[PDB]
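Notebook p. 47: complex prediction with chloride ion.
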Amino acid sequence: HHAPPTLWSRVTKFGSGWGFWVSPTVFITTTHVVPTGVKEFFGEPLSSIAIHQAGEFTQFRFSKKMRPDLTGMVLEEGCPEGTVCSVLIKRDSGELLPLAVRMGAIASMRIQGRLVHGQSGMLLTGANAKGLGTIPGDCGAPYVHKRGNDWVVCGVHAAATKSGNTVVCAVQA
Ligand SMILES: [Cl-]
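Predicted complex, structure tokens below:
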């Protein structure tokens, strides 16, 4: 299942990583990539943004439509165990590098002393090109899967082992 161009157009450079437009007003990312001490995000003052973050998942809901080109899509708290997700990793050049992952259990974990409310997954060696998810710049990339004719987003990239074989997305409680 190939994420279509419009779905990739939601993936946006943010802080030290990426985030994702769920709708014209809702942007999600991983908390540790969010810049701090700033007065605005995407030009909008803090006073016009409703922030909801917990467990390394950050959601911003802007008061104004920031990406009216987008439809609203479903954001879920993780996905059923065994779901194959695509992690929509972009690189700075604009190259698209989707990573296929088989999802495991949703749980609360501590990672580098940070509480991560997340879902573990395993990289699918057999569905990915050899030689992703293992550099700081990849955090915040969305985990998506296709349900019927619709794509669902269910987490943001938060952690991975040194090898990248085991990953964790933060999920919204
Ligand atoms: Cl889309």
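Notes: The chain has one helix and 14 strands. The longest strand covers residues 96-111.
Next step: compare against the earlier run before touching the bench.
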